[PDB]
Amino acid sequence: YKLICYYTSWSQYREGDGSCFPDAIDPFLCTHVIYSFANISNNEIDTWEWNDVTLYDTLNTLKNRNPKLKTLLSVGGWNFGPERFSAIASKTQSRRTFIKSVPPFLRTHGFDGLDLAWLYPGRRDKRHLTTLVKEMKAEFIREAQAGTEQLLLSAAVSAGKIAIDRGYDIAQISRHLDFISLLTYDFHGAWRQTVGHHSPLFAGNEDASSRFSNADYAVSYMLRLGAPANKLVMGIPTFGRSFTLASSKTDVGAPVSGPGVPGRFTKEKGILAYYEICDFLHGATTHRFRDQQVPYATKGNQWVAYDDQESVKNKARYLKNRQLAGAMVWALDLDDFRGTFCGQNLTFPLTSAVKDVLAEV
Ligand SMILES: CC(=O)N[C@@H]1[C@@H](O)[C@H](O[C@@H]2O[C@H](CO)[C@@H](O[C@@H]3O[C@H](CO)[C@@H](O)[C@H](O)[C@H]3NC(C)=O)[C@H](O)[C@H]2NC(C)=O)[C@@H](CO)O[C@H]1O
Numbered sequence: 284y285k286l287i288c289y290y291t292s293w294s295q296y297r298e299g300d301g302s303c304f305p306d307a308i309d310p311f312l313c314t315h316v317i318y319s320f321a322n323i324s325n326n327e328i329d330t331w332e333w334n335d336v337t338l339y340d341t342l343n344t345l346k347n348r349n350p351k352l353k354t355l356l357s358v359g360g361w362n363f364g365p366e367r368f369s370a371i372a373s374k375t376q377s378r379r380t381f382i383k384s385v386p387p388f389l390r391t392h393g394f395d396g397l398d399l400a401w402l403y404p405g406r407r408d409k410r411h412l413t414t415l416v417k418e419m420k421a422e423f424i425r426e427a428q429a430g431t432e433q434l435l436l437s438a439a440v441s442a443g444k445i446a447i448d449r450g451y452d453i454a455q456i457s458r459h460l461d462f463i464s465l466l467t468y469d470f471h472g473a474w475r476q477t478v479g480h481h482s483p484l485f486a487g488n489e490d491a492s493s494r495f496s497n498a499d500y501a502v503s504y505m506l507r508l509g510a511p512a513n514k515l516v517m518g519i520p521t522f523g524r525s526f527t528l529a530s531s532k533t534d535v536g537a538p539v540s541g542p543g544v545p546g547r548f549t550k551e552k553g554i555l556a557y558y559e560i561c562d563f564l565h566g567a568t569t570h571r572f573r574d575q576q577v578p579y580a581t582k583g584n585q586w587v588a589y590d591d592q593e594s595v596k597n598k599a600r601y602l603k604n605r606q607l608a609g610a611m612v613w614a615l616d617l618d619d620f621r622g623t624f625c626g627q628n629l630t631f632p633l634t635s636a637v638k639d640v641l642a643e644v
């Protein structure tokens with residue numbers, strides 16, 4: 284089993300305890316740590332934060348304590364326009380430029396592979412995304428001749444029935460990718476004026492109409508489209524999406540006025556770090572959709588959908604039962620990395636929970 288963990292660049296700038304650096308990461312927790320995100324300039328992979336080279340080096344020195352640990356650098360991301368990706372993949376000339384720029388970069392900084400986070404290719408991009416993946420892998424193969432261990436190539440893929448059908452040739456890119464991370468935590472939110480859970484595991488006999496927005500459907504669909512179980516990694520959230528209620532109705536379908544108030548540390552409307560949720564929980568009524576097997580909480584006019592230890596072990600048992608390759612966690616810096624916010628003194632409570640289940644049978 285693989286436990287792929289993302290670490291995000293900007294989490295260094297959070298104040299107080301929210302501030303998180305590579306060295307706060309337990310070398311033995313994950314099997315792969317992914318640094319998000321690299322920029323692209325004059326069609327070449329490039330850094331993003333001013334101190335990326337220091338943090339790269341910090342993250343990669345962890346391989347000194349755990350030698351089996353592999354690290355990767357993710358490209359693209361959310362504040363990286365998909366049109367920007369689009370324009371590079373469609374012109375064989377600039378694509379080849381970017382591809383050739385990658386290996387030396389990873390080699391200089393010490394990464395073991397690249398992670399493609401193009402979010403998201405449209406109907407018009409499907410053909411080129413297939414190409415970028417092919418040629419990139421082809422290049423990683425040609426470079427291993429120099430005598431060094433071959434670089435890995437992975438991609439963070441959408442888990443939405445429509446997004447998959449529109450922009451991904453799943454049968455083609457699995458042959459070429461070392462593993463695929465399924466973004467199974469983006470099923471609600473997206474600005475819809477009703478309350479709902481962004482990452483349920485199951486359909487839930489109740490509000491069905493969506494019938495496609497759950498990890499179970501997403502996983503089953505990918506297997507059917509041609510992706511082999513041993514390359515699929517299922518995404519597990521370490522954050523929750525919040526909502527400001529528009530009425531006193533707290534149950535399913537209740538109306539919503541907009542995102543939830545910002546977290547004291549993460550400072551962004553609509554999402555909350557798990558360690559912030561640990562604190563939000565005191566004084567809140569907690570609930571659990573039993574059909575979907577994920578919790579949610581309320582306090583005043585704040586409604587929060589999140590993942591506790593229990594729901595996360597549950598998801599982990601599921602991927603074990605469908606024989607997937609492992610779990611992907613977004614993100615280490617949102618978990619209780621210090622272990623001083625959630626009660627029971629344990630650093631990385633959610634990621635550890637996943638790791639425990641994966642370490643059993
Ligand atoms: C749950 C989660 O991880 N959400 C991510 C988004 O938050 C993230 O966007 C990033 O937004 C933050 C603020 O929300 C940006 O932080 C700023 O970063 C710059 C340095 O680049 C720093 O000067 C600022 O102090 C800092 N402060 C602010 C305004 O809060 C961050 O730059 C954004 N990401 C990038 C690559 O620049 C998106 C990003 O793609 O990812 C979500 O996962």
Ligand SMILES: *[C@@H]1O[C@H](CO)[C@@H](O[C@@]2(O)O[C@H](CO)[C@@H](O[C@@H]3O[C@H](CO)[C@@H](O)[C@H](O)[C@@H]3O)[C@H](O)[C@H]2NC(C)=O)[C@H](O)[C@H]1NC(C)=O
Nearest residue numbers: 321322323324325326327329330331332333362363364367
């Ligand atoms: C990530 O890479 C992108 C694209 O390579 C960068 O995009 C900008 O910022 O690039 C230029 C240069 O910063 C911006 O300004 C131009 O800068 C030159 C000289 O440096 C100047 O003479 C030009 O006339 C412009 O004034 C453009 O506005 C941006 N282009 C685009 C499409 O983004 C970006 O800076 C990088 N982002 C980070 C955070 O590294």
